[PDB]
């Protein structure tokens with residue numbers, strides 16, 4: 447039974463204690479037993495005006511942010527507040543539907559076996575696995591010919607249209623960030639555009655974190671780094687919870703309305719020879735309100751061999767990561783963090 451979890455939104459309704467499968471060992475808890483989860487992020491806060499990324503001072507801000515945090519907030523990103531609010535409303539609308547309606551999109555293929563795409567939870571591997579306090583709807587967006595539209599919610603009926611339009615807007619953001627990164631690494635503005643390739647990948651993950659009566663005991667999403675090249679994250683109504691690790695310390699990622707958060711993923715850490723790192727991040731829950739986010743994961747095409755860019759290497763700049771085909775990295779990332787296995 448334990449390999450077929452009931453959605454946390456159901457298990458959380460009205461409870462005053464988290465069920466045992468969500469409770470972390472005391473030393474793993476946010477605050478490690480206590481109620482102080484994270485430190486405020488010190489100034490300067492990493493914020494990048496995406497419309498001015500060709501100005502030298504703005505490019506410098508992007509570089510500083512990537513060296514320091516591996517992530518940054520973006521303003522002037524070209525996405526209407528109306529579209530951001532509507533795509534997150536469509537997500538909320540879906541999660542508020544009855545369990546049996548959402549389960550038509552279940553990622554448990556016969557109610558028993560996990561796959562990534564669909565509505566439900568991440569894979570449960572071992573009965574001792576501590577589960578995260580969240581549900582998610584995860585969908586293949588690109589390459590468009592690999593989509594399985596049977597997993598895309600039909601209600602509200604504008605869900606697909608809104609996701610398609612939003613993702614076309616975050617793809618613009620992806621391209622601007624990647625071009626700025628090729629330039630600052632002196633690899634050519636185009637370098638990462640060519641890396642992701644014609645069949646560049648895009649996955650949409652709608653996260654739903656129910657309120658938790660004991661946020662000191664659980665993770666909304668456990669510490670992790672993302673697997674792709676860059677992630678573009680939208681947090682609905684800027685509800686707090688997202689935290690980033692730097693030097694063993696957990697820092698609150700600040701909220702800014704109508705902004706996006708851009709963070710690097712493991713594929714970029716490999717490609718850029720670890721000059722910038724893929725940041726480890728987590729979500730802590732709260733007692734008062736649900737929290738919703740939409741992560742757009744952008745990665746390289748499946749056949750691309752991930753390796754440190756030749757332009758970053760030389761006699762005194764050895765490769766720090768071993769070569770691996772992108773699809774094999776993602777599979778290995780699924781089944782000690784996985785990117786450490788690639789270090790040489």
Ligand SMILES: CS(=O)(=O)c1ccc(C(O)=C2C(=O)CCCC2=O)c([N+](=O)[O-])c1
Nearest residue numbers: 647648672673674743744745748772773
């Ligand atoms: C959830 S994740 O481990 O960050 C994550 C998982 C899979 C993918 C994605 O499907 C890609 C391709 O399909 C296969 C090659 C690698 C590439 O990454 C992404 N992505 O496109 O960014 C992220």
Ligand SMILES: O=C(O)CCC(=O)C(=O)O
Nearest residue numbers: 651653672688729739741
């Ligand atoms: O909900 C968030 O703010 C973070 C989501 C996240 O880390 C992920 O979906 O990989």
Ligand SMILES: [Co+2]
Nearest residue numbers: 670671672727
């Ligand atoms: Co993440």
